[PDB]
Amino acid sequence: DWVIPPINLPENSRGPFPQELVRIRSGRDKNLSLRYSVTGPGADQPPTGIFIINPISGQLSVTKPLDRELIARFHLRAHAVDINGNQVENPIDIVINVI
Amino acid sequence: DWVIPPINLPENSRGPFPQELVRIRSGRDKNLSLRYSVTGPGADQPPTGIFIINPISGQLSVTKPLDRELIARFHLRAHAVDINGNQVENPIDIVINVI
Numbered sequence: 001d002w003v004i005p006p007i008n009l010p011e012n013s014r015g016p017f018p019q020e021l022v023r024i025r026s027g028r029d030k031n032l033s034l035r036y037s038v039t040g041p042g043a044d045q046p047p048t049g050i051f052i053i054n055p056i057s058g059q060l061s062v063t064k065p066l067d068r069e070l071i072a073r074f075h076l077r078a079h080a081v082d083i084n085g086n087q088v089e090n091p092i093d094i095v096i097n098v099i
Numbered sequence: 100d101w102v103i104p105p106i107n108l109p110e111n112s113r114g115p116f117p118q119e120l121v122r123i124r125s126g127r128d129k130n131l132s133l134r135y136s137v138t139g140p141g142a143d144q145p146p147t148g149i150f151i152i153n154p155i156s157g158q159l160s161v162t163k164p165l166d167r168e169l170i171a172r173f174h175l176r177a178h179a180v181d182i183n184g185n186q187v188e189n190p191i192d193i194v195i196n197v198i
Contacts, residue, residue, distance in 0.1 A: 078101075
């Protein structure tokens with residue numbers, strides 16, 4: 001039940017975009033084909049597509065510049081699934097503060 | 100089995116020291132008195148005392164400035180234990196890159 005520390009991203013990033021933020025992976029993907037996805041507002045809920053996660057690497061990226069005066073915090077969950085779509089473990093909550 | 104992303108700390112930090120880096124806690128400490136400790140080189144093995152973790156908050160700090168040319172990476176493990184010292188969950192590995 002370790003909580004991943006919140007990421008802090010300054011607003012007005014000049015990118016380039018997509019801008020790689022941090023790798024979010026499950027140690028077990030090395031010896032088990034895993035698929036990563038992210039869910040939540042900023043991902044698959046309004047606002048949509050501000051954060052994407054590369055399915056095999058778990059590399060999470062931001063797609064455009066942020067604005068702390070519009071949205072100051074994002075809360076997403078990353079998920080890891082096997083070859084048949086079964087989640088191999090509980091989703092990890094991800095907190096992103098726009099600074 | 101989510102791996103916590105590595106922290107990146109620039110060398111020659113002017114502190115002040117101790118310098119609070121990141122909170123490393125177990126979500127369950129909120130409804131269960133937990134005690135945090137860190138182990139590994141840079142913590143309780145040479146070089147000793149470069150990173151400390153506050154026992155109740157899980158707030159991890161660095162005690163002096165780093166030097167990437169001397170030690171470029173630290174690998175510590177945080178631990179969470181109950182009122183009787185039982186570990187309540189597996190230790191989380193922590194990777195700190197000196198940039």
